[PDB]
Amino acid sequence: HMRIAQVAPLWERVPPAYGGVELVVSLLTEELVKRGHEVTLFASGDSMTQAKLVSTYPHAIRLDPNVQEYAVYEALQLGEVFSRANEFDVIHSHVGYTALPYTSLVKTPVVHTLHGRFTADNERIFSQYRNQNYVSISHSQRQLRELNYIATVYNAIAVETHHFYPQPSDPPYLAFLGRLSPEKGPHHAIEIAKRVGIPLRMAGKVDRVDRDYFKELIEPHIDGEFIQFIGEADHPTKNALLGGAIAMLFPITWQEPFGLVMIESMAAGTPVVAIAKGAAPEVIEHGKTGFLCHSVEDCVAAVAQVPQLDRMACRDYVWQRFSVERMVSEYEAVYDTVLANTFV
Amino acid sequence: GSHMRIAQVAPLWERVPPAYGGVELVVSLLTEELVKRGHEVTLFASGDSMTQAKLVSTYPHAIRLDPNVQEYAVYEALQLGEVFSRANEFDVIHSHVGYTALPYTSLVKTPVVHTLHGRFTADNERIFSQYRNQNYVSISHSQRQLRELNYIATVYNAIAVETHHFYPQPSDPPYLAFLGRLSPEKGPHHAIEIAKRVGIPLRMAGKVDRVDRDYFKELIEPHIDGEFIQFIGEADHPTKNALLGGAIAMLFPITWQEPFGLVMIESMAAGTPVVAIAKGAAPEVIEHGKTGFLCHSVEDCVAAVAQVPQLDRMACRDYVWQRFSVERMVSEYEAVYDTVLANT
Ligand SMILES: O=c1ccn([C@@H]2O[C@H](COP(=O)(O)OP(=O)(O)O)[C@@H](O)[C@H]2O)c(=O)[nH]1
Ligand SMILES: O=c1ccn([C@@H]2O[C@H](COP(=O)(O)OP(=O)(O)O)[C@@H](O)[C@H]2O)c(=O)[nH]1
Ligand SMILES: OC[C@H]1O[C@](CO)(O[C@H]2O[C@H](CO)[C@@H](O)[C@H](O)[C@H]2O)[C@@H](O)[C@@H]1O
Ligand SMILES: OC[C@H]1O[C@](CO)(O[C@H]2O[C@H](CO)[C@@H](O)[C@H](O)[C@H]2O)[C@@H](O)[C@@H]1O
């Protein structure tokens, strides 16, 4: 019953393959409008939404050879958001710190959902707008504390769209999903699959800056027989790619804000053996829906402890803490708190 | 009428500059002069910048040189956030950052004067036409490639000629010169081929950065390991002055729509003609047959070097004083402010 604006990034599509935030903004927007609200999506033009689409570019900036300066369309989008700031009751910004200086100029309250790691550089712009409205996707992400965190909403997925696999494929294999960046540590997943004797079926995208790390540590160890690649899969693939696997290796070497590939694996009914970094303990129920490992050798030992877990429970676990009914209804109270706590 | 509150917004890649510094040098002479005429200037640059106006530092070093910064876009939104939060304290804002400040102008009441320093790429042509009805000041006539914009004026950049020692006849062992970054846009590869057909050695001096590091190690690197081509890249003011002053003719072979190119008027300041390719804003600075030459190919330059000792080298210095003096530039910009302050 409010005028909401969801400012999504332009790198991807509301998303056929890669894209985490755009998937979260989708399940949020596609359900907010269903509850008699009034949302105006701010994303790309190829987006298939059920709200008033307002875009500055039709295609996605990532999969496009004709684009070169993304910061142009980054500033074009915000130029249309805060120009229409009088037509909105609350602005839900997902673009990150690029909207902080614009918030101190308009009148409409703006909420910022954090989606990345705080680095030694971006922590300065957050300290200059510490009292702004923030929303963390995990308690582990809340690292600055000095900011003004409104609440903590766990990212969710449409569980019914993920087909559930009870028993894995008869010839077992491991799994890896996500970008091939050092932030996800696929090189550990390569060794873990080889220290146990179970093949690995990887899947993800390789953008640049990852060109150096990929073809120096990941490409040398591809075979197609024991190590497959499948560069960037869609939804029906990762649905069955993780379903037929015994466990989704998630050996991160980076402060993971959340990790939607963990909750996606478990919907298909697959426990995630990940490193207890970032929001890994906040998602993985130890001994029930995965194993919170603390070393590379801990994952190898946990692999033998994977088949004894209940894969039918892993899906019912996502239906509890990681449901869209929990996430959207938890944002519906965040917007009211921001609107009720304004002037003093 | 002659007591304004100017707001100089400068880039952060280099300080207001030790060696390489294009836009940072123009802002320097413009700031130091306007303060010397009585205006209340407010500079938004780095921290080590040396000015007399009340500067507002957002990071105490040049980001290009400081390696601790991995995201330049962080301090971008910080500087622009501090400018337009104090816009009420200014009479007019002079932006030098580019398209990043266009959506900000459509949010306050202080008029902003945008001085363009870059080419209209296939991407920024979308944002510049969006904020078409604003206040733009070009730096050359050839730089105007949209035409349909709202150009307030065209103020050619200027340098302090008195700070450039005049070398009459150069060094008796003759050599050439190349100034500017070693980018395929400014064409450093063309300068060596002319140095072979003319047979005179070429002494270079520039800057190499990412995205172009592959080009440096490919085309330019296998030709400098010798006395014929002495590199010593990135020279400060007292070093690059003797380089151009001791050069019989500066090689400026460009293959890109140059908006201006301060390296040209710096060569002629110390008394040295420039042989540039007929492209961009080269005919607007170089006078054919008087203080240099304009060529349509590479062999046309080889025939031009044979007609350089006949060129007047003293008239090169007096030509910069004609239309590239700091007193002229600042007077034009000071006259631009009265145009913007009268339209409101
Ligand atoms: O082949 C792939 C690789 C990635 N993804 C999607 O990319 C998102 C990445 O999830 P996550 O948040 O955990 O990784 P990050 O955001 O750090 O890139 C997931 O939702 C996946 O659905 C996908 O669909 N197919
Ligand atoms: O080794 C160098 C190379 C360049 N410059 C300075 O960088 C400026 C060149 O500006 P230009 O417009 O030609 O390059 P751009 O700004 O387009 O990058 C000149 O004033 C030079 O004084 C320098 O000092 N040393
Ligand atoms: O760590 C940088 C990382 O962030 C980007 C965003 O451009 O990737 C994101 O892609 C989508 C949203 O664009 C989300 O899944 C999530 O925010 C990130 O994975 C990219 O620079 C880099 O891969
Ligand atoms: O505004 C960013 C601008 O800087 C880049 C960074 O890669 O490089 C330019 O930096 C100097 C700044 O003085 C420019 O004079 C010069 O054109 C570039 O080397 C450029 O791509 C970005 O557009």
CSV table of N, CA, C and O in Angstrom, one decimal, chain A residues 29-78:
chain,number,residue,atom,x,y,z
A,29,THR,N,10.5,-7.8,-5.6
A,29,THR,CA,9.6,-7.0,-6.4
A,29,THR,C,8.4,-7.8,-6.9
A,29,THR,O,7.2,-7.4,-6.9
A,30,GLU,N,8.6,-9.0,-7.4
A,30,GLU,CA,7.6,-9.9,-7.9
A,30,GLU,C,6.6,-10.3,-6.9
A,30,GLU,O,5.5,-10.7,-7.2
A,31,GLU,N,6.9,-10.1,-5.6
A,31,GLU,CA,6.0,-10.4,-4.5
A,31,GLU,C,5.4,-9.2,-3.9
A,31,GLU,O,4.2,-9.2,-3.4
A,32,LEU,N,6.1,-8.1,-3.8
A,32,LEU,CA,5.6,-6.9,-3.3
A,32,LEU,C,4.4,-6.4,-4.1
A,32,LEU,O,3.4,-6.0,-3.5
A,33,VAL,N,4.5,-6.4,-5.4
A,33,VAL,CA,3.4,-6.0,-6.2
A,33,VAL,C,2.2,-6.9,-6.1
A,33,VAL,O,1.1,-6.5,-6.1
A,34,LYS,N,2.5,-8.2,-5.8
A,34,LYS,CA,1.4,-9.2,-5.6
A,34,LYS,C,0.6,-8.9,-4.3
A,34,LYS,O,-0.5,-9.4,-4.2
A,35,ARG,N,1.2,-8.1,-3.4
A,35,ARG,CA,0.5,-7.8,-2.1
A,35,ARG,C,-0.1,-6.4,-2.2
A,35,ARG,O,-0.1,-5.7,-1.2
A,36,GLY,N,-0.6,-6.0,-3.3
A,36,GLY,CA,-1.3,-4.7,-3.4
A,36,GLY,C,-0.5,-3.5,-3.2
A,36,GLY,O,-1.0,-2.4,-2.9
A,37,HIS,N,0.8,-3.6,-3.4
A,37,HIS,CA,1.7,-2.4,-3.2
A,37,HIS,C,1.8,-1.7,-4.6
A,37,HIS,O,1.0,-1.9,-5.5
A,38,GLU,N,2.7,-0.8,-4.7
A,38,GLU,CA,2.9,0.0,-5.9
A,38,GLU,C,4.4,0.2,-6.1
A,38,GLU,O,5.0,1.2,-5.6
A,39,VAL,N,5.1,-0.7,-6.8
A,39,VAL,CA,6.5,-0.7,-7.0
A,39,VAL,C,6.8,-0.3,-8.4
A,39,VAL,O,6.0,-0.5,-9.4
A,40,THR,N,7.9,0.4,-8.6
A,40,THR,CA,8.4,0.9,-9.9
A,40,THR,C,9.9,0.4,-10.0
A,40,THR,O,10.8,1.0,-9.4
A,41,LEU,N,10.1,-0.7,-10.7
A,41,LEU,CA,11.4,-1.3,-10.8
A,41,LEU,C,12.4,-0.4,-11.6
A,41,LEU,O,12.0,0.1,-12.6
A,42,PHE,N,13.6,-0.3,-11.1
A,42,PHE,CA,14.7,0.4,-11.7
A,42,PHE,C,15.8,-0.6,-12.1
A,42,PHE,O,16.6,-1.0,-11.2
A,43,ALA,N,15.8,-1.1,-13.3
A,43,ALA,CA,16.8,-2.0,-13.7
A,43,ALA,C,17.0,-1.9,-15.2
A,43,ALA,O,17.1,-0.8,-15.8
A,44,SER,N,17.2,-3.0,-15.9
A,44,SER,CA,17.4,-3.0,-17.4
A,44,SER,C,16.1,-3.1,-18.1
A,44,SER,O,15.0,-3.1,-17.5
A,45,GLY,N,16.2,-3.1,-19.4
A,45,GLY,CA,15.0,-3.1,-20.3
A,45,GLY,C,14.5,-4.5,-20.6
A,45,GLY,O,13.3,-4.7,-20.9
A,46,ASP,N,15.4,-5.5,-20.6
A,46,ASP,CA,15.0,-6.8,-20.9
A,46,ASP,C,14.4,-7.6,-19.7
A,46,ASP,O,14.1,-8.8,-19.8
A,47,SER,N,14.2,-6.8,-18.6
A,47,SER,CA,13.7,-7.4,-17.4
A,47,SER,C,12.2,-7.7,-17.6
A,47,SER,O,11.5,-6.9,-18.1
A,48,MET,N,11.8,-8.9,-17.1
A,48,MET,CA,10.4,-9.3,-17.2
A,48,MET,C,9.7,-9.2,-15.9
A,48,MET,O,9.6,-10.2,-15.1
A,49,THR,N,9.3,-8.0,-15.5
A,49,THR,CA,8.7,-7.7,-14.2
A,49,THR,C,7.2,-7.5,-14.3
A,49,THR,O,6.7,-7.5,-15.5
A,50,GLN,N,6.5,-7.4,-13.2
A,50,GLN,CA,5.1,-7.1,-13.3
A,50,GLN,C,4.8,-5.7,-12.7
A,50,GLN,O,3.6,-5.5,-12.3
A,51,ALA,N,5.7,-4.8,-12.7
A,51,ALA,CA,5.6,-3.4,-12.2
A,51,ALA,C,6.0,-2.4,-13.3
A,51,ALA,O,6.4,-2.8,-14.4
A,52,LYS,N,5.8,-1.2,-13.0
A,52,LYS,CA,6.2,-0.1,-14.0
A,52,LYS,C,7.7,-0.1,-14.2
A,52,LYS,O,8.4,0.4,-13.3
A,53,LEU,N,8.1,-0.6,-15.3
A,53,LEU,CA,9.5,-0.7,-15.6
A,53,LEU,C,10.0,0.7,-16.0
A,53,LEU,O,9.4,1.3,-16.9
A,54,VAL,N,11.2,1.1,-15.4
A,54,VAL,CA,11.8,2.3,-15.8
A,54,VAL,C,13.3,2.0,-15.9
A,54,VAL,O,14.0,1.7,-14.9
A,55,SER,N,13.8,2.0,-17.2
A,55,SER,CA,15.2,1.6,-17.4
A,55,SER,C,15.9,2.6,-18.2
A,55,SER,O,15.3,3.5,-18.9
A,56,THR,N,17.3,2.6,-18.1
A,56,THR,CA,18.1,3.5,-18.9
A,56,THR,C,18.8,2.8,-20.1
A,56,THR,O,19.3,3.4,-21.0
A,57,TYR,N,18.9,1.4,-20.0
A,57,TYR,CA,19.5,0.6,-21.0
A,57,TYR,C,18.7,-0.7,-21.2
A,57,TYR,O,18.3,-1.3,-20.2
A,58,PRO,N,18.4,-1.1,-22.5
A,58,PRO,CA,17.6,-2.3,-22.6
A,58,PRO,C,18.3,-3.6,-22.3
A,58,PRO,O,17.6,-4.5,-21.7
A,59,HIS,N,19.6,-3.7,-22.6
A,59,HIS,CA,20.3,-5.0,-22.4
A,59,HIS,C,21.0,-5.0,-21.1
A,59,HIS,O,21.0,-4.0,-20.4
A,60,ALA,N,21.7,-6.1,-20.8
A,60,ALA,CA,22.6,-6.2,-19.6
A,60,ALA,C,24.0,-5.7,-20.0
A,60,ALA,O,24.5,-5.9,-21.1
A,61,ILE,N,24.6,-5.0,-19.0
A,61,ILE,CA,25.9,-4.4,-19.3
A,61,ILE,C,27.0,-5.5,-19.4
A,61,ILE,O,27.9,-5.4,-20.2
A,62,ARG,N,26.8,-6.6,-18.6
A,62,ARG,CA,27.8,-7.7,-18.7
A,62,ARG,C,27.9,-8.3,-20.1
A,62,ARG,O,28.9,-8.2,-20.8
A,63,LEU,N,26.8,-9.0,-20.4
A,63,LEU,CA,26.7,-9.7,-21.7
A,63,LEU,C,26.3,-8.6,-22.8
A,63,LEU,O,25.2,-8.6,-23.3
A,64,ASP,N,27.3,-7.8,-23.2
A,64,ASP,CA,27.1,-6.8,-24.2
A,64,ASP,C,28.5,-6.3,-24.7
A,64,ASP,O,29.3,-5.8,-24.0
A,65,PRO,N,28.8,-6.5,-26.0
A,65,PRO,CA,30.1,-6.0,-26.6
A,65,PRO,C,30.0,-4.6,-27.0
A,65,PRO,O,31.1,-4.0,-27.2
A,66,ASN,N,28.9,-3.9,-27.0
A,66,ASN,CA,28.7,-2.6,-27.5
A,66,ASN,C,28.9,-1.5,-26.3
A,66,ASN,O,28.8,-0.3,-26.6
A,67,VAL,N,29.0,-2.0,-25.1
A,67,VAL,CA,29.1,-1.1,-23.9
A,67,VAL,C,30.5,-1.2,-23.4
A,67,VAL,O,31.2,-2.2,-23.5
A,68,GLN,N,31.0,-0.1,-22.9
A,68,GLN,CA,32.3,0.0,-22.3
A,68,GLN,C,32.4,0.8,-21.0
A,68,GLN,O,33.3,0.5,-20.2
A,69,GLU,N,31.5,1.8,-20.8
A,69,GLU,CA,31.5,2.6,-19.6
A,69,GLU,C,30.3,2.3,-18.8
A,69,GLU,O,29.2,2.9,-19.1
A,70,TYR,N,30.3,1.4,-17.8
A,70,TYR,CA,29.1,1.1,-17.0
A,70,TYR,C,28.8,2.3,-16.1
A,70,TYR,O,27.6,2.5,-15.8
A,71,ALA,N,29.8,3.1,-15.6
A,71,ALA,CA,29.5,4.2,-14.7
A,71,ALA,C,28.6,5.2,-15.4
A,71,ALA,O,28.0,6.0,-14.6
A,72,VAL,N,28.6,5.3,-16.7
A,72,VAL,CA,27.6,6.2,-17.3
A,72,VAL,C,26.2,5.8,-17.0
A,72,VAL,O,25.4,6.7,-16.6
A,73,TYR,N,25.8,4.6,-17.3
A,73,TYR,CA,24.5,4.1,-17.0
A,73,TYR,C,24.3,4.0,-15.5
A,73,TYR,O,23.1,4.0,-15.0
A,74,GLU,N,25.3,3.8,-14.7
A,74,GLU,CA,25.2,3.8,-13.2
A,74,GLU,C,24.7,5.2,-12.7
A,74,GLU,O,23.8,5.3,-11.9
A,75,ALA,N,25.2,6.3,-13.3
A,75,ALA,CA,24.8,7.6,-13.0
A,75,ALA,C,23.5,8.0,-13.7
A,75,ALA,O,22.8,8.9,-13.2
A,76,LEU,N,23.2,7.4,-14.8
A,76,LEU,CA,21.9,7.7,-15.5
A,76,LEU,C,20.8,7.1,-14.7
A,76,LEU,O,19.7,7.8,-14.6
A,77,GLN,N,20.9,5.9,-14.1
A,77,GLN,CA,19.8,5.4,-13.3
A,77,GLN,C,19.5,6.2,-12.1
A,77,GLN,O,18.4,6.6,-11.9
A,78,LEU,N,20.6,6.5,-11.3
A,78,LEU,CA,20.4,7.4,-10.1
A,78,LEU,C,19.9,8.8,-10.5
A,78,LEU,O,19.2,9.4,-9.7
